[PDB]
Design a protein around this ligand. Sequence first.
Ligand code: GDP
Length: 151
Amino acid sequence: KVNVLVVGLDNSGKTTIIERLKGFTVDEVEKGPLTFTVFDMSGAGRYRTLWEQYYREADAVVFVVDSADKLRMVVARDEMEHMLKHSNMRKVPILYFANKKDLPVAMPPVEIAQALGLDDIKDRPWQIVPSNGLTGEGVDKGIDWLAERLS
Ligand SMILES: Nc1nc2c(ncn2[C@@H]2O[C@H](COP(=O)(O)OP(=O)(O)O)[C@@H](O)[C@H]2O)c(=O)[nH]1
């Protein structure tokens, strides 16, 4: 099994995106040897310890961000940092979906990289792909980037 975590704050669009492909709550989506484990990083410390249990077997991460929500980008950055620093998270590829690129206030990848501090990630591959979860624009491109980097 190839395990891909699909994460981000609530309202980022992750359920909408993964639908295209096929207390604390998780959803599982199978696509052959790929298994997507999909969950929200909402609630801060309330459930964080639960979801960190999925890190050990993670082969890649899809981090979904609402491109148009600055406030939650603050919390998203924090949760991302917890993930990166966790001893069970291996140095596996991270695909960032800059989702809701259709919205007027959508931040472009350069702004998102700055907001999240992605340029400081130098120990594993990562890429930001703007996406529209409603039309599917960008989604296949992002998944293909990730799939070619599995090991
Ligand atoms: N405008 C716009 N809305 C989106 C996009 N992707 C998802 N949404 C909407 O954002 C809301 C939250 O989506 P959801 O998949 O439930 O996010 P989740 O909590 O991370 O799974 C839903 O109402 C979606 O219809 C997008 O690319 N553009």
